[PDB]
Amino acid sequence: DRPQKPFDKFFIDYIGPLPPSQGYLYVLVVVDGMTGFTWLYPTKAPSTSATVKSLNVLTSIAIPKVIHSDQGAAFTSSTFAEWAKERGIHLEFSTPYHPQSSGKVERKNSDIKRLLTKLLVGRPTKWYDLLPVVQLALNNTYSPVLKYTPHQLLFGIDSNTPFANQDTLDLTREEELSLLQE
Amino acid sequence: DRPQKPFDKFFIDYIGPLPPSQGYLYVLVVVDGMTGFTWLYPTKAPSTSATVKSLNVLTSIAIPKVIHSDQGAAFTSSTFAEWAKERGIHLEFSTPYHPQSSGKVERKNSDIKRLLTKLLVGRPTKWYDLLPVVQLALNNTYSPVLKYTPHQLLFGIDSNTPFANQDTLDLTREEELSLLQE
Amino acid sequence: DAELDQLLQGHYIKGYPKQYTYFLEDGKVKVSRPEGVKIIPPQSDRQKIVLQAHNLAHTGREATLLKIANLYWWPNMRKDVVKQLGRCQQCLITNASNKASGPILRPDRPQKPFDKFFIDYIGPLPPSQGYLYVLVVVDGMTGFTWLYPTKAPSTSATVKSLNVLTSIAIPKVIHSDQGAAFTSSTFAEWAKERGIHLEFSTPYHPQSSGKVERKNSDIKRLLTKLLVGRPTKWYDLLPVVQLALNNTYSPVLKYTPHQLLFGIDSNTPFANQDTLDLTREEELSLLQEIRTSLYHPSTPPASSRSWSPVVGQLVQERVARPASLRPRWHKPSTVLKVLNPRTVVILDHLGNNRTVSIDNLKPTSHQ
Amino acid sequence: DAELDQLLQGHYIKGYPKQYTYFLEDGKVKVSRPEGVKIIPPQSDRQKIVLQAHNLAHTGREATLLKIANLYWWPNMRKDVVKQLGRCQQCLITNASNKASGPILRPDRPQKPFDKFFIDYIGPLPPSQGYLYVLVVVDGMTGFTWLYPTKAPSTSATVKSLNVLTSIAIPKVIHSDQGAAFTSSTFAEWAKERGIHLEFSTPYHPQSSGKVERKNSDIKRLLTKLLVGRPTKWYDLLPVVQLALNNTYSPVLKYTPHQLLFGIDSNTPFANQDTLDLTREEELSLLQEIRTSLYHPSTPPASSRSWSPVVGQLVQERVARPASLRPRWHKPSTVLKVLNPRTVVILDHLGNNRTVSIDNLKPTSHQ
DNA sequence: ATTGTCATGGAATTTCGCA
DNA sequence: TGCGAAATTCCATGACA
DNA sequence: ATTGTCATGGAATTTCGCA
DNA sequence: TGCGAAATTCCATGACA
Ligand SMILES: Nc1c(C(=O)NCc2ccc(F)cc2F)c(=O)n(O)c2ncc(CCS(=O)(=O)CCN3CCOCC3)cc12
Ligand SMILES: Nc1c(C(=O)NCc2ccc(F)cc2F)c(=O)n(O)c2ncc(CCS(=O)(=O)CCN3CCOCC3)cc12
Ligand SMILES: [Mg+2]
Ligand SMILES: [Mg+2]
Ligand SMILES: [Mg+2]
Ligand SMILES: [Mg+2]
Ligand SMILES: [Mg+2]
Ligand SMILES: [Mg+2]
Ligand SMILES: [Zn+2]
Ligand SMILES: [Zn+2]
C-alpha cells in the first residue's frame, strides 16, 4: 500500500457562526490529512458559493486528490460536486451524525477551536486580522506523533518563525470570567 | 598668387522693389565670385535686418572670406559691419557710383535681371514661388568662359537637372506688349 | 487498439523495443521502463494527450514532454509533441523567436552628392519659438546635413523645407521611413513633379534610414551640450549646429561633410589650406578621387544562430503596436521574394504584398 | 615666447625635432612639416586654441585634433587635446560611454524555500473587474509564484496581499526594486514587525529583480495566449496562470516550482508518481538533495572592452528620466566602496551615498 | 517594392626621431 | 637597424522616437 | 547599503536498441 | 564494438515597464 502523502486528502469543515469581524462570520478550515497543515479562509456564510470562492484560492496553489467533509449542505450540493469533478477531486463524506476524520486531524481541529476561543475573548470582533498568525501557529506546532511540525512535513525545511513558547491553550481565570459575560 | 576659389568672395546686391509676391518685395542676390553660383533670398526691405536674416541662412551653409557690395545703406551700416566681423568676413565696397564686380559676376547679374523680367510678365505677383527654379537655371547655365556650369564648379559633379534647352532670355513680341501695359 | 493488441502477446511492432515486457493492468497497456512503469496509450488517443499536456501552460517541446513522460510512453513522443507545437496558433504568435537575424548589409555609399537624400523628422522637442520638430536632410554621399525647424512632421512642412533646399540642387533619390509626412499622396506628387524617386524604408525599421538617424544623434548631442545650464531654446541653435556638424571631421574618413561636398573649406575656423596652390579644376580632380577612395565597411560576421530567408518559408511579421496582453507576432505568412538577405516580400496577414525587414520577422517554428 | 625665441636661431628644445627648419613669417613662428607649413603657437596660446577647436562641435580627440592640425603644430598636441576633453563639462555629461559593463554576476540560488522572496508589480493592464495591476511574488529557491491582483501598485495593496501570503510561511528576506510601494516607511514597518529583512535592488536596474522579472514574462506570455481572440478579462485567469506556471517544468532543472517547494505533485494533470512507494520522510530526504544539486549558471566571459569599478575612480551615474535635449549622465562622482564587481557606492551628485549598479555608470573619460 | 551608421576613447599598431 | 615614444589606426560600444 | 533570469527550439552531443 | 536513430543536452536568443 502507498504511504500517506500530502495532498492525498484535505479535510474541510466550517467553524461558526462567529461574532462579525469586518463582515465575515464563518471560517472554512482545510487540513491536509498527512502533514496536518491548516488553511483558514473566512467566509460570510456556510454556503457552496463561499466554499467554492475560498477553495478556488487554495486549489490555485495545490489540488487534493480527495476532499473529506461531513454531510453539510455546502458540501453535499450538486454545485460543489460539479466543482470537485471539474478539478478531478473525489468527494468523500462521513456518515451523518458520525464525524470521521483522523486522529491527527481530530486533534488539529481541536487545537483550532480552542486557539480561536483564547483570542476571541477581549477582542471578539477582531479575529479576521488574526487569521494569518493563527495559521502560522497551527502549522508550526510540534506534532508529538510525527515529531515534525506541519510546516516541516509540507516543505521539508525549518520555518523562519518557530513557535517554541506556545500559549497555554487553556482559558486563564480572568479570560474565563470575561467570556461568560459575552 | 593663389588661384581663385569658391567662398573666396561673395558678391551681394539687392534687386527691387518688385511687385508684391506673398509679402516680399526685394531679392538679395548672392553670387560666388569664382564659380558664379547664385543664391536668391526674398526680403521685405533692402535693410540690414533683412540682409542679416537672409545671410544667416547662407552663412549656416558656407562662410565667404570676403563679401563685396556697393555702398548701399544695408551694407555700410555699423550693424552689418559687426555681423561680418563676428563671422570673420571681410567687407569690401565698390566706389560710390562706380559698381565694381567681375566679368563673370557682371554677366551673371545681367542674366538674373533679364531672367526675372521674362517670368515676371503674365504673373508679376507669383515670382516668390519661382525663386527655387530660377536658382537651378542660373546655377546650371553653361559658362562659355570656364566651360563649366556653376553647379559643376561648386560640387565637382554633373547636375541631375541639366538645362540644355534654355529660354530665349529675350522678350517675345507678345510678352513685350503685355509688359508695357503693366 | 489492434496495433497494441499484438504487442501484449509478444509480437514485435516497429518502434516498440522488444527487450521490454509489455503487459496489461487496470485495462491499460503498460510497459516497465527504466524510469518506471508508463502507460502506452493507443494511437487514437495520443493527439489528445499531447494537447492536454501542452494546453496546461502552452509550454514548448521539453516542458511539454516532461509532463507526458510522467504518465505515458510511446514511440517518438517528441515527434507528436512538435507536431502540436506547430499547430498551436496561440504559441506561434506569442512566443519569442530564438534565431537572430542575418548579418546587416552595408549598402554602398552613394557615388555622388545629391544621388540620394536621407530625410527624417526629430521631435517632438520643447517648444522653441513655436517650433516643435526638425526636418533633417542628410546627403548620403557626403553626410552634409540641412536642418529645418517645423511645427509638425507634416507633408506641407516637408514640401516647404525641401523647396528651399532643392533651390541648390535636385536629388536623384530621397529616402525616408514610412511616416505620414513622406507616404502621403501629396508628397509623391511633389517628388514626381521634380523627377525625384521616393525610396522608402521597410516599415518599423529605422536601421534602413540609419544614415540620417545617426546624424540625428549628433544633432541632439550637440544641441544638448550647447543648452547645458540654459533653457532649451534650440531654434536659434539649428543654424549653429548645422554649420558645426557639416564642418566636423569624421575620424575614419579624415574629411568633413563640407569637404566631401565642396572639396574646399569655407571661411570657418581652422579651415584646411592644403589645396591653396592648386587650381579649382585640380581641386575638383583631387575631390573626385577622394569621393571614390572613401572607407566603406563590410558585412559583419553572422551570429552563430542566425537565420536567412528563403522563398516559400513560413515567417511571421512582428506586430507594430501590440496592445497589452496581445500577441507580439502576426499569423504565419509566406516569403514571396527575397530582395536581399535582409529584405523580403511576404503575403501579408491581410492578403497584401508587404516588403518587410527580417528584423521584424521570425521563422515560424516547427516548420 | 622666450621658449620659441631660442628655436628660431637654431638652438635645440626638447620636444621639437631638430631636423626641421623653424622660421618666422608674418610675425608667427612656423615649421615646414611633411603635411605642410604649420604655425607653432606659443605655449601661452595653446590652451585657447584647443578650446576654440573643440568648442566648434564639442568633438572628441581625433575630430578636434584634425581641426587644429589644419593650421597649427606643437609637441604632443593630443596631450593638450585630451586635457581639455577631460575638463569640458558638457562633453563629460552628454557623450555616451564606449566601455561595456563587466560580466554579470549569477548570485547563488537561495538554499531553502522562503529564504528570499522577489516581489514586483505588473501593470497597468486593461481594466479587469476594476483591477489594473498584479503583485508577483516569486520564491527565489523554488520559483514558486503567487499572483495578487491590485487596483494600484501601492503599499496598502502590497501589505494586504502579503498578509494573505505570509499566512503560509514568513520569509527571511523580501527583495524588490525601489518603487514607491516597497520603499515607503509603512512597508518597512510592516516587514520589521514580522522580522523580514527588506532587500532593495539598485535603482533603475530591473536585472537585480531578474528572478521575478523573468517570471513576469511567463505570466504575461501565458495570459496573452489564453486571451487570444477573447477580450482581455485577465482577472479570472490569474489563479489559472498561477497554478499552471507553478506546475511547469523548467527544462534545465527537470523540476517544476511546485516540486521544488513540496517534493510531490498535487492532483494536477500529469502528476509525477515516481516517489509513490517512498515515505514522506524518504521523499523530503530526496527533496533536500534535489534542492542542493540544482544547476547553477556561472559568470559569462567579459566582453573585450569591459570596465570594472575601482575605489576612488571618477564615475558618472546615468540620469534616470533625462528631459529632452538634456544630458544623459550626471556630473562625475567618486567610487566610495566596491561591494561587488557590479555594485558600488558613490558620493552622489547631491552629496549623498548612493548604491548603484555599474550598468547605470560610466567611467569618466580622460581620467 | 529594398539594405544601418558613425563619433568615441582606450588599446593595438604603425610611424617618427634619433643613432 | 633598432630603440622608445609619439602618432596613427583599430574597433567595441552605444544611440539615433 | 548589493548581485539577472530562464523558456525556447534547432543544433550538438549522448544514449539507446540491436547485432 | 559499432552502427543509425532516438533521446538528451546544449545554448544562443530575447523579453520581463
Ligand atoms: N520609431 C521610429 C524611430 C526610431 O525608433 N528610431 C530609433 C532607432 C532605433 C534603432 C535604430 F537602428 C535607429 C534608430 F533611429 C525613428 O528614428 N524614426 O525616425 C521614426 N520615424 C517614424 C516612425 C513612425 C513610423 S509609422 O507609425 O508612421 C508607420 C506607419 N505605417 C507604415 C506602413 O505600414 C503601416 C503603418 C517611427 C520612427
Ligand atoms: N523600469 C522598470 C522595469 C523594467 O524596465 N523592466 C524591464 C526590464 C528590462 C531589463 C531587464 F533586465 C529586466 C526587466 F524587467 C521593471 O520591470 N520594473 O518592475 C520596474 N519597477 C519600478 C520602476 C520604477 C522605479 S522608480 O521610478 O519608482 C525609482 C524611484 N526612486 C528610486 C531611488 O532613487 C530615486 C528614485 C521601474 C521598473
Ligand atoms: Mg460540517
Ligand atoms: Mg547695391
Ligand atoms: Mg522617422
Ligand atoms: Mg528617426
Ligand atoms: Mg517594479
Ligand atoms: Mg518589473
Ligand atoms: Zn500553445
Ligand atoms: Zn565639449
Side-chain angles (χ1 to χ4, degrees):
Chain A
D1 210 337
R2 318 293 153 80
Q4 190 175 4
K5 289 294 178 54
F7 316 133
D8 285 359
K9 188 171 302 181
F10 279 6
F11 292 86
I12 67 170
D13 195 45
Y14 273 106
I15 291 184
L18 306 175
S21 181
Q22 295 195 27
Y24 294 93
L25 298 175
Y26 289 75
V27 172
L28 177 60
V29 174
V30 188
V31 174
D32 180 59
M34 188 275 145
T35 64
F37 202 88
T38 295
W39 293 269
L40 300 177
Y41 296 107
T43 67
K44 298 179 184 177
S47 55
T48 302
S49 171
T51 304
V52 168
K53 180 174 187 174
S54 285
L55 290 185
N56 275 339
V57 181
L58 181 59
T59 49
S60 67
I61 293 177
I63 302 180
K65 294 184 177 181
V66 178
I67 285 183
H68 182 100
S69 62
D70 47 21
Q71 301 258 347
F75 313 136
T76 51
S77 61
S78 60
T79 304
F80 189 76
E82 295 175 20
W83 175 92
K85 185 184 175 181
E86 288 166 359
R87 287 147 186 79
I89 300 179
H90 172 83
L91 289 188
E92 163 183 313
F93 303 95
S94 55
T95 287
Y97 310 103
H98 296 77
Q100 252 217 205
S101 307
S102 80
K104 198 188 201 321
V105 173
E106 287 179 8
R107 295 183 292 270
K108 183 60 66 177
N109 280 96
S110 172
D111 301 339
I112 300 175
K113 294 186 294 180
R114 284 210 294 164
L115 178 56
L116 286 177
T117 311
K118 183 175 177 57
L119 300 187
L120 271 181
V121 299
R123 41 182 178 179
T125 60
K126 298 181 181 181
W127 56 265
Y128 175 90
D129 312 285
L130 297 176
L131 285 180
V133 70
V134 171
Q135 296 188 47
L136 292 177
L138 300 165
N139 292 323
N140 295 294
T141 292
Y142 175 81
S143 168
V145 174
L146 281 169
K147 297 191 176 182
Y148 288 116
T149 67
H151 181 106
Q152 296 168 348
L153 292 169
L154 185 60
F155 306 113
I157 57 172
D158 285 14
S159 164
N160 304 326
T161 59
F163 283 69
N165 264 264
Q166 294 283 35
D167 60 337
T168 63
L169 219 55
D170 309 310
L171 294 177
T172 73
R173 201 183 181 277
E174 291 198 357
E175 302 169 10
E176 171 193 358
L177 288 178
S178 63
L179 177 59
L180 301 171
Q181 190 171 347
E182 297 168 328
Chain B
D1 210 337
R2 318 293 153 80
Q4 190 175 4
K5 289 294 178 54
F7 316 133
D8 285 359
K9 188 171 302 181
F10 279 6
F11 292 86
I12 67 170
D13 195 45
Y14 273 106
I15 291 184
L18 306 175
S21 181
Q22 295 195 27
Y24 294 93
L25 298 175
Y26 289 75
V27 172
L28 177 60
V29 174
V30 188
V31 174
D32 180 59
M34 188 275 145
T35 64
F37 202 88
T38 295
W39 293 269
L40 300 177
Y41 296 107
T43 67
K44 298 179 184 177
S47 55
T48 302
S49 171
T51 304
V52 168
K53 180 174 187 174
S54 285
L55 290 185
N56 275 339
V57 181
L58 181 59
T59 49
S60 67
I61 293 177
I63 302 180
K65 294 184 177 181
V66 178
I67 285 183
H68 182 100
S69 62
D70 47 21
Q71 301 258 347
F75 313 136
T76 51
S77 61
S78 60
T79 304
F80 189 76
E82 295 175 20
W83 175 92
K85 185 184 175 181
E86 288 166 359
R87 287 147 186 79
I89 300 179
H90 172 83
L91 289 188
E92 163 183 313
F93 303 95
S94 55
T95 287
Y97 310 103
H98 296 77
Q100 252 217 205
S101 307
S102 80
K104 198 188 201 321
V105 173
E106 287 179 8
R107 295 183 292 270
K108 183 60 66 177
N109 280 96
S110 172
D111 301 339
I112 300 175
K113 294 186 294 180
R114 284 210 294 164
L115 178 56
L116 286 177
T117 311
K118 183 175 177 57
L119 300 187
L120 271 181
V121 299
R123 41 182 178 179
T125 60
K126 298 181 181 181
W127 56 265
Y128 175 90
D129 312 285
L130 297 176
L131 285 180
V133 70
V134 171
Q135 296 188 47
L136 292 177
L138 300 165
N139 292 323
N140 295 294
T141 292
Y142 175 81
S143 168
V145 174
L146 281 169
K147 297 191 176 182
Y148 288 116
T149 67
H151 181 106
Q152 296 168 348
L153 292 169
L154 185 60
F155 306 113
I157 57 172
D158 285 14
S159 164
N160 304 326
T161 59
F163 283 69
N165 264 264
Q166 294 283 35
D167 60 337
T168 63
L169 219 55
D170 309 310
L171 294 177
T172 73
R173 201 183 181 277
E174 291 198 357
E175 302 169 10
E176 171 193 358
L177 288 178
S178 63
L179 177 59
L180 301 171
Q181 190 171 347
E182 297 168 328
Chain C
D1 203 339
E3 176 198 39
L4 285 70
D5 205 339
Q6 306 227 16
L7 193 66
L8 290 179
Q9 52 193 17
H11 291 50
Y12 169 80
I13 289 89
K14 180 182 180 179
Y16 304 80
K18 168 70 177 185
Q19 59 161 316
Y20 288 97
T21 52
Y22 308 94
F23 62 96
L24 182 139
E25 180 175 345
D26 297 324
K28 302 172 182 176
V29 180
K30 300 182 180 178
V31 59
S32 178
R33 294 195 59 82
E35 310 86 25
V37 180
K38 307 297 177 178
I39 298 177
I40 305 184
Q43 175 68 22
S44 60
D45 279 323
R46 294 171 188 179
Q47 169 167 337
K48 187 186 181 188
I49 290 179
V50 176
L51 184 67
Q52 291 180 178
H54 170 78
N55 277 13
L56 294 176
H58 283 278
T59 51
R61 189 225 307 149
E62 290 305 307
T64 304
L65 173 87
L66 287 168
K67 276 306 196 190
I68 318 183
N70 283 336
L71 293 185
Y72 302 105
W73 178 93
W74 64 79
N76 312 315
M77 291 174 70
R78 286 178 171 86
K79 183 181 180 179
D80 294 318
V81 168
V82 176
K83 186 176 182 181
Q84 287 303 303
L85 301 185
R87 293 183 176 181
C88 180
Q89 198 71 9
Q90 300 90 307
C91 284
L92 296 176
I93 62 182
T94 304
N95 286 341
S97 178
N98 59 331
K99 296 100 178 60
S101 300
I104 61 169
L105 297 174
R106 305 313 300 274
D108 281 321
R109 179 184 301 269
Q111 294 185 1
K112 303 175 185 175
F114 310 104
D115 278 358
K116 182 179 293 187
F117 278 0
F118 291 86
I119 68 173
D120 188 23
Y121 270 105
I122 294 178
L125 298 183
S128 185
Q129 302 276 303
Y131 289 87
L132 295 172
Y133 294 78
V134 172
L135 178 61
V136 183
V137 184
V138 176
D139 174 69
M141 142 67 217
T142 58
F144 199 94
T145 302
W146 291 265
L147 305 185
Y148 295 94
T150 71
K151 296 174 182 176
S154 58
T155 299
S156 60
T158 311
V159 161
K160 294 185 179 183
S161 298
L162 285 183
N163 283 338
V164 174
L165 170 55
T166 50
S167 300
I168 199 179
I170 300 278
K172 291 186 172 65
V173 180
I174 286 183
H175 185 103
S176 68
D177 53 54
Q178 298 195 28
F182 311 132
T183 58
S184 66
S185 53
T186 294
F187 188 65
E189 299 167 11
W190 176 93
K192 185 184 178 183
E193 286 172 354
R194 289 155 178 80
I196 300 181
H197 176 56
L198 291 188
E199 200 177 44
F200 292 103
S201 295
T202 50
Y204 305 101
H205 194 252
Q207 296 189 5
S208 304
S209 297
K211 210 84 174 189
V212 58
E213 298 294 354
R214 180 55 170 90
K215 186 68 61 173
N216 294 341
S217 184
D218 290 340
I219 296 161
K220 306 183 95 172
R221 178 162 62 99
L222 187 56
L223 280 177
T224 294
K225 297 175 182 179
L226 303 179
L227 293 174
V228 168
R230 297 183 176 87
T232 49
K233 302 181 181 184
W234 56 265
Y235 180 85
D236 297 337
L237 284 180
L238 280 196
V240 180
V241 170
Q242 174 180 287
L243 180 68
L245 294 180
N246 280 337
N247 289 272
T248 286
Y249 279 94
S250 172
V252 67
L253 300 183
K254 301 297 184 52
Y255 301 98
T256 74
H258 176 96
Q259 292 163 353
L260 295 178
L261 181 62
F262 299 110
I264 178 179
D265 280 331
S266 67
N267 191 23
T268 49
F270 300 88
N272 184 276
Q273 305 174 14
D274 288 344
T275 62
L276 201 49
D277 291 327
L278 297 177
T279 70
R280 185 48 178 177
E281 190 169 5
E282 296 162 358
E283 225 176 35
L284 295 182
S285 185
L286 179 62
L287 173 61
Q288 290 167 358
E289 190 179 22
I290 287 175
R291 293 171 162 165
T292 57
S293 63
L294 287 183
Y295 162 81
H296 187 257
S298 56
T299 290
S303 63
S304 53
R305 294 183 185 177
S306 61
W307 76 279
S308 284
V310 175
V311 180
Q313 184 180 15
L314 281 185
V315 301
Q316 306 181 230
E317 186 184 6
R318 187 190 313 274
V319 175
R321 296 178 175 85
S324 187
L325 298 183
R326 295 303 187 185
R328 260 52 181 169
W329 301 93
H330 289 293
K331 59 178 180 177
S333 52
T334 311
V335 180
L336 296 184
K337 186 171 179 56
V338 173
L339 312 181
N340 56 51
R342 299 267 302 165
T343 322
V344 302
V345 183
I346 65 180
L347 187 48
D348 201 357
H349 69 278
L350 303 175
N352 309 83
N353 282 20
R354 199 169 174 87
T355 299
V356 298
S357 175
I358 66 172
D359 283 353
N360 295 320
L361 289 177
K362 74 170 185 169
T364 299
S365 301
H366 326 290
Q367 299 173 344
Chain D
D1 203 339
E3 176 198 39
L4 285 70
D5 205 339
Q6 306 227 16
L7 193 66
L8 290 179
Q9 52 193 17
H11 291 50
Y12 169 80
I13 289 89
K14 180 182 180 179
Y16 304 80
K18 168 70 177 185
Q19 59 161 316
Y20 288 97
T21 52
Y22 308 94
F23 62 96
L24 182 139
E25 180 175 345
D26 297 324
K28 302 172 182 176
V29 180
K30 300 182 180 178
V31 59
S32 178
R33 294 195 59 82
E35 310 86 25
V37 180
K38 307 297 177 178
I39 298 177
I40 305 184
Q43 175 68 22
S44 60
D45 279 323
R46 294 171 188 179
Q47 169 167 337
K48 187 186 181 188
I49 290 179
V50 176
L51 184 67
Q52 291 180 178
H54 170 78
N55 277 13
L56 294 176
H58 283 278
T59 51
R61 189 225 307 149
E62 290 305 307
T64 304
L65 173 87
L66 287 168
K67 276 306 196 190
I68 318 183
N70 283 336
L71 293 185
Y72 302 105
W73 178 93
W74 64 79
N76 312 315
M77 291 174 70
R78 286 178 171 86
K79 183 181 180 179
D80 294 318
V81 168
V82 176
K83 186 176 182 181
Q84 287 303 303
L85 301 185
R87 293 183 176 181
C88 180
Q89 198 71 9
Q90 300 90 307
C91 284
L92 296 176
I93 62 182
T94 304
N95 286 341
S97 178
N98 59 331
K99 296 100 178 60
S101 300
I104 61 169
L105 297 174
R106 305 313 300 274
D108 281 321
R109 179 184 301 269
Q111 294 185 1
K112 303 175 185 175
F114 310 104
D115 278 358
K116 182 179 293 187
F117 278 0
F118 291 86
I119 68 173
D120 188 23
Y121 270 105
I122 294 178
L125 298 183
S128 185
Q129 302 276 303
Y131 289 87
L132 295 172
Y133 294 78
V134 172
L135 178 61
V136 183
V137 184
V138 176
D139 174 69
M141 142 67 217
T142 58
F144 199 94
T145 302
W146 291 265
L147 305 185
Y148 295 94
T150 71
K151 296 174 182 176
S154 58
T155 299
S156 60
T158 311
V159 161
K160 294 185 179 183
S161 298
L162 285 183
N163 283 338
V164 174
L165 170 55
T166 50
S167 300
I168 199 179
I170 300 278
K172 291 186 172 65
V173 180
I174 286 183
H175 185 103
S176 68
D177 53 54
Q178 298 195 28
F182 311 132
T183 58
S184 66
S185 53
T186 294
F187 188 65
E189 299 167 11
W190 176 93
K192 185 184 178 183
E193 286 172 354
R194 289 155 178 80
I196 300 181
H197 176 56
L198 291 188
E199 200 177 44
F200 292 103
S201 295
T202 50
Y204 305 101
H205 194 252
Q207 296 189 5
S208 304
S209 297
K211 210 84 174 189
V212 58
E213 298 294 354
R214 180 55 170 90
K215 186 68 61 173
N216 294 341
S217 184
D218 290 340
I219 296 161
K220 306 183 95 172
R221 178 162 62 99
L222 187 56
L223 280 177
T224 294
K225 297 175 182 179
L226 303 179
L227 293 174
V228 168
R230 297 183 176 87
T232 49
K233 302 181 181 184
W234 56 265
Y235 180 85
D236 297 337
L237 284 180
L238 280 196
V240 180
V241 170
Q242 174 180 287
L243 180 68
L245 294 180
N246 280 337
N247 289 272
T248 286
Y249 279 94
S250 172
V252 67
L253 300 183
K254 301 297 184 52
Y255 301 98
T256 74
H258 176 96
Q259 292 163 353
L260 295 178
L261 181 62
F262 299 110
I264 178 179
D265 280 331
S266 67
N267 191 23
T268 49
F270 300 88
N272 184 276
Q273 305 174 14
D274 288 344
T275 62
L276 201 49
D277 291 327
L278 297 177
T279 70
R280 185 48 178 177
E281 190 169 5
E282 296 162 358
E283 225 176 35
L284 295 182
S285 185
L286 179 62
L287 173 61
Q288 290 167 358
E289 190 179 22
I290 287 175
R291 293 171 162 165
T292 57
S293 63
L294 287 183
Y295 162 81
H296 187 257
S298 56
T299 290
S303 63
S304 53
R305 294 183 185 177
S306 61
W307 76 279
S308 284
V310 175
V311 180
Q313 184 180 15
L314 281 185
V315 301
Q316 306 181 230
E317 186 184 6
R318 187 190 313 274
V319 175
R321 296 178 175 85
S324 187
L325 298 183
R326 295 303 187 185
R328 260 52 181 169
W329 301 93
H330 289 293
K331 59 178 180 177
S333 52
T334 311
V335 180
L336 296 184
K337 186 171 179 56
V338 173
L339 312 181
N340 56 51
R342 299 267 302 165
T343 322
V344 302
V345 183
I346 65 180
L347 187 48
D348 201 357
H349 69 278
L350 303 175
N352 309 83
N353 282 20
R354 199 169 174 87
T355 299
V356 298
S357 175
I358 66 172
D359 283 353
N360 295 320
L361 289 177
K362 74 170 185 169
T364 299
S365 301
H366 326 290
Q367 299 173 344

